[PDB]
């Protein structure tokens, strides 16, 4: 697609409430996973990881990695992605959580574990996708 995967979207000044990140693309026909990683260097404040075939099930895993410890996984069985199909992911930053919507439907909320939001300066987009667009705006 017009953007190369993996793709790093800089977040100058980090994330702040009211920030909306929009990502559009298509899932590859033989997809295994998608990853969105809100990063503070080597740490990952918010890892959003649709897994298409984990023990023969679809699941979204969300987590945080701080000092190479992954935390408690937050798992959602609701899974709005499909092999070969277009998607739109929107992540809205609020003061207490990230809110994620896919295809204009609310999917999940993830409470901030890494709380220095102005230091989360990169969003990495990786995995089995074609990416058409990735951008952010303050709403
Ligand atoms: C492979 O390690 C993944 C982590 N990961 C994935 C990637 C990644 C990055 C990229 F750039 C990529 F391109 C890319 F493809 C993947 N980087 N780190 C990350 O997703 C992390 C999130 O917690 O998970 C580990 S695997 C983690 C291992 O520990 C046990 C966990 N396990 C199994 C079950 C469980 C619970 N309920 C029902 N069935 C099974 N529960 N926990 C398991 O999920």
Swiss-Prot record:
Phosphoserine modification, residue list: 77
Key word Transmembrane present: no
Cellular component aspect of the GO annotation: cell surface; collagen-containing extracellular matrix; cornified envelope; cytoplasm; external side of plasma membrane; extracellular matrix; extracellular region; extracellular space
Subcellular location: Cytoplasm; Nucleus; Secreted
GO MF, one example: carbohydrate binding
Domain Galectin: 7-137
Tissues and organs where the protein is expressed, per its UniProt entry: The highest levels are found in activated macrophages.
GO biological process, one term: RNA splicing
Motif Nuclear export signal mapped to chain: 115-130
Main location: cytoplasm
Keyword set, alphabetical order: Acetylation, Cytoplasm, Differentiation, Disulfide bond, IgE-binding protein, Immunity, Innate immunity, Lectin, mRNA processing, mRNA splicing, Nucleus, Phosphoprotein, Repeat, Secreted, Spliceosome
Binding site for a beta-D-galactoside: 70-76
Domain of life: Eukaryota
Assembly mode: Probably forms homo- or heterodimers. Interacts with DMBT1. Interacts with CD6 and ALCAM. Forms a complex with the ITGA3, ITGB1 and CSPG4. Interacts with LGALS3BP, LYPD3, ZFTRAF1 and UACA. Interacts with TRIM16; this interaction mediates autophagy of damage endomembranes. Interacts with and inhibits by binding NCR3/NKp30.
Functional note: Galactose-specific lectin which binds IgE. May mediate with the alpha-3, beta-1 integrin the stimulation by CSPG4 of endothelial cells migration. Together with DMBT1, required for terminal differentiation of columnar epithelial cells during early embryogenesis. In the nucleus: acts as a pre-mRNA splicing factor. Involved in acute inflammatory responses including neutrophil activation and adhesion, chemoattraction of monocytes macrophages, opsonization of apoptotic neutrophils, and activation of mast cells.
Protein name per its UniProtKB record: Galectin-3
Organism: Mus musculus (Mouse)
Range covered out of full length: 126 to 264 of 264
């Amino acid at each position: 697609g017009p953007l190369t995967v993996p793709y790093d979207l800089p977040l100058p000044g980090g994330v702040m409430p009211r920030m909306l990140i929009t990502i559009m693309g298509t899932v590859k026909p033989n997809a295994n996973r998608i990853v969105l990683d809100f990063r503070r260097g080597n740490d990952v404040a918010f890892h959003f990881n649709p897994r298409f075939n984990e023990n023969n099930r679809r699941v979204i895993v969300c987590n945080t990695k701080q000092d190479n410890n992954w935390g408690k996984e937050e798992r959602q069985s609701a899974f709005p992605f499909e092999s070969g199909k277009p998607f739109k992911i929107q992540v809205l930053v609020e003061a207490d959580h990230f809110k994620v919507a896919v295809n204009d439907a609310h999917l999940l909320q993830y409470n901030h574990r890494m709380k220095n939001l102005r230091e989360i300066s990169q969003l990495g987009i990786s995995g089995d996708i074609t990416l058409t667009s990735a951008n952010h705006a303050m709403i």
